[PDB]
Amino acid sequence: PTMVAAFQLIRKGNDPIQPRDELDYAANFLYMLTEREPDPVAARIFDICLTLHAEHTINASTFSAMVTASTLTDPYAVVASAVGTLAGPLHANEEVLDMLEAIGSVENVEPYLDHCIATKTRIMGFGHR
Amino acid sequence: SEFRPGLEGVPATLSSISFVDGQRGVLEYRGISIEQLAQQSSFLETAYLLIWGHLPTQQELTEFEHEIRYHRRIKFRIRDMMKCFPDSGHPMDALQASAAALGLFYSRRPEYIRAAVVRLLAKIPTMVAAFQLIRKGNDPIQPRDELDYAANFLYMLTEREPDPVAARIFDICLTLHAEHTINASTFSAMVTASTLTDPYAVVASAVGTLAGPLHGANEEVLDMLEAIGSVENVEPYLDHCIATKTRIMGFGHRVYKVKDPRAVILQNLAEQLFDIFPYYEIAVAVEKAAAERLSHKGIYPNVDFYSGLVYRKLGIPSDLFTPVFAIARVAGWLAHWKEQLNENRIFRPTQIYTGSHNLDYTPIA
Amino acid sequence: SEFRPGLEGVPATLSSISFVDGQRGVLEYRGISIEQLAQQSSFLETAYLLIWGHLPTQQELTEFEHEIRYHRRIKFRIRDMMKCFPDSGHPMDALQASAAALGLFYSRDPEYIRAAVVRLLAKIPTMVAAFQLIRKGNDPIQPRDELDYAANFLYMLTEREPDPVAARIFDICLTLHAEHTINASTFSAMVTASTLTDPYAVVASAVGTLAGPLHGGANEEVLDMLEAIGSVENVEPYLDHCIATKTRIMGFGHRVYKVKDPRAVILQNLAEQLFDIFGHDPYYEIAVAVEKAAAERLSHKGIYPNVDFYSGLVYRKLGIPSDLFTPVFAIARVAGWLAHWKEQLNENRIFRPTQIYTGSHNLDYTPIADR
Amino acid sequence: SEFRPGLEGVPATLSSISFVDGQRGVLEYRGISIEQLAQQSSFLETAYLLIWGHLPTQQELTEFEHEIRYHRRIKFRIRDMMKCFPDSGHPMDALQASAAALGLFYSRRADDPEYIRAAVVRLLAKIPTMVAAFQLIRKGNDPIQPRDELDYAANFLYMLTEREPDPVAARIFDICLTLHAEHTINASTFSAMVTASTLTDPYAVVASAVGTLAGPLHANEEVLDMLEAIGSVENVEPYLDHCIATKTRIMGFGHRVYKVKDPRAVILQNLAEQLFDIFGHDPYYEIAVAVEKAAAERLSHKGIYPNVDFYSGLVYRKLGIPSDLFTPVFAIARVAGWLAHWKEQLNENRIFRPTQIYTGSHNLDYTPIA
């Protein structure tokens, strides 16, 4: 978390912020990312979101991590390979937000329905495989 | 009425920012009295009045202050660049270099009228304080988000929180110099902005051409006040300077001769500052002696004679007397650039040739 | 009484450097014809003539060349600073910033009329070449001490030693733009130097003024128009569209010269020679096609191609990036600016123009509680 | 050294006939509230007050009204001259030409009490007859002789339309005229005053004023045209999109100096709604109400309000008047202010002769044939 927050600050040309040894985990990450101290309710919501996103079944990234770790070299290379293979093509939820912004108000609902009907393809952001 | 050496008295442009009157000694910003404006207004309100031409309401002023405070932070790339500057340089040259480098990060080019001015009004004091600290040797100090503009500048410079009275006195002293009649620096800025390139270049040119010979009057007046000796030595050196046919600096303005309001108001603020918080007694003694002993030549102490004292008391290095004046004048420079952006006159004075014609180039000389 | 709107005709100063008259098509440096001078002279001789006003001797020219060669090395601090510069910016802004920074290293009696000019004339080409190399990520190249001035500049820019004929052509092109009449950049330099501060601030302000509006140049827009023309067949439609809209077609027709200014014809001849000795390419073919299709009817109203139209093609064939056009002009422009500053150093009188106030009078401030 | 651009904010004259507030929305004729005069005062009383400055007496008012009625007859030579006019000429140009030609038949230029009263009464009386006659001629119809029994506005309406109107409509027209009687100094008033400075004659002054009054391409008519173009309320959204995108002040809404709900607008809309409830409501008036409501619901925060021109055009259209006659109605309404300014300027004699700033070349040479 410290590394990713530091790079996020650097990408905008801002000096990295030293972490605090008093706040909670999610609270510390949010403070490092935004410099603004958040409410404990938001910190708890972020923590439970992380813990529900903690782990899933075997997928491509987990399989790559396991096959790399099979030779028991070191965890750092394994996690590096896993995060490298995690990135999808052109680097879904962000695309969902972009599509939502593109749609705008509810006056443009019908073209979306027409497109989804005509394409005969699973609309992204809806349903699981 | 075509040719006149020095280009003196020839009108240049339909300016609508500053007004002057030698016979009455008045001064107005958008037709508002200088004394009344300085009495009950802040620096940001004065800058808004000089730029947009109309006083701001509550929400406009709050938004302007919020944007100023948000954008007052300085990108670390500028700090890294200024780390490489040599320690033997001069503050104004470094300020010009920084203002020129700022153009790289914000080239860009309907909203390109308000972001540039707020960024350029916010970042200059931080950069100049950072270079002062770097020349001294210590690392820069990040700005706060609670202090006032003058208070924030003082905290950045002398790493100490100033009293609210000192902050107010510095704010009024800064807004006193916020604008003046067209002069060399303002005319050069107007010429540069006639081509409508960008604010970051016209401001750089203006701060470059603002440097006087030998790299203002504050340093020389402070040097002469320090070198005058004691109270009993006021007469000898003063009469020596009178006899040597040398004009006495710090007195006798070219245009104003009726005790211009800036000088008297700055003297009043200096008097009210000194009592609540050496230089004071000797300065008042020498100025009183000069005033009582000349009494005929229209000799009056101008603004700088007391501006130097008010800067020295507040804890500012002697060399830094020029960058604060540049910070004050940048508001007027931006106002002139905004006004001239519409004209699109494209100045192009034609010279007159006074040489020879139809010579030959000899292969051997 | 009288008021000229923008100093359009008021005489600025008693200029004695150059003189231009459109009636006879004469452009003289120190009263010397441009074509005859450029026929058998180099850039250094022209610069010395512009600076001092008299042709030097062989020994003095050799000493000046030796001093120029000796002062080509760039300080490593400036290289580090440019390594700390961004990349998305434009080269001219970086050049202006570097010129402003140059004053920090050198500051502070008779000798301080000769060292400044030579240092400023020598460092700027290597500086812009180093920034160009840094912009693409490549390291700067240390200059050589055996090549010629144009050869050294080409070696810095393209790391390939060019033919002597190409170096001569580049030198001729540089000395062609050596100095022109007073304009916005020259007047800004003059007014900055009127306070006799230092050549560095003057050249920085002048370079800042020279920056074209919207960060563009005449050569850049000429090349853009040529690309927008497309193939050879599409020459007529675009030309007749430009004629119909009553808009001055770029690269055709100057403002002061209507009698076939010698710079245009001499640069056209140089371009012809350079394009004929080297590869022809389609650039020259399309340029000839469009220039003929324009001039076959524009000659009625006295419209002729100007210098920049040929200069852009010459620079393109020479192997120079498009964005670097402005600094190349700036080299000759600072060469001229140093002469204007030297002329201005004699008379000490700053420009102090007045103004006519067009605003209100005797208003009053209103507290926030009412407005 | 001062030089204002456009001669703005310069005390051209010391006028005492009209006053405006600019902050409280007050309008005063001779220092009298506009609403007070508009409540229970006729057009002739307002004109007399503007001309003389003191409220008339009953006998004086009756004498002035009888004099006005007696001079309503137009010379047949004027009709014969207007006969030769083309049928394409816009009405205001013909009105200016007729006003200028009136000076030929009256060249007193010297009793003195007569040449302060006869000229002004004739100029105030003959203009409506002239404009109505040209309106009839433009359509190829024989001019109608005026009647010496109806009221001023009633007589004008009868001459224009040949149909006798109701007294309520006549009163509404009269109060509209009296609220349009005079305003502050503007371009037309300034031109009239500068022409009258040399105290030649009122006819030339009024001719110049009506000539300079005509705008480019000869606002309220444009407002009506735009309203007709919009049609029903189904086309409101493209209008809002256009107004948002253009970033320009929509014509017919708001005033240059009045952003405080100008007093004339509310009075005029009250008169309009009174007329429309008395004489029934037509669909286009309801369309106007709908579009003005849909505008004010969004433009209120920016300080944009419907202007008097819109309501004036609406009421004129509802009264049965051609669109091209809007400008002559404004001219006949305003003709009191020009006469008042001429009368007040006649007391003094200060010829206007400002200087100029020369921005040209100072000396050149004359090419013989080159």
Residue numbers in the entry:
A (entry chain H): 133 to 223, 226 to 263
B (entry chain D): 5 to 113, 118 to 223, 225 to 286, 290 to 377
C (entry chain C): 5 to 112, 117 to 379
D (entry chain R): 5 to 114, 116 to 223, 226 to 377
Give the original sentences from the paper that presented this experimental model.
Three dimers are first arranged in a hexameric ring and three hexamers then connect into a triangle. In the 18mer (level 1), CS dimers assemble into hexamers through a heterologous interface similar to known hexameric CS proteins. The 18mer is then formed through an additional contact between two dimers of adjacent hexamers. This interface has an unusual geometry, whereby only one monomer from each dimer participates in the interaction. The two participating monomers form an interface between the amino terminus of one monomer and the carboxy terminus of the other and vice versa. An interaction between the residue E6 from one monomer and H369 of the other establishes an important contact, and mutating either E6 or H369 to alanine or deleting amino acids 2–6 (Δ2–6 SeCS) abolishes the formation of fractals. In the two non-participating monomers, the termini face outwards. They cannot engage in the same interaction with another dimer without causing a steric clash and thereby passivate the edge of the triangular assembly. In the 18mer, the non-equivalence between chains allows the interaction to form at the correct angle and ensures that no more dimers can associate into it.
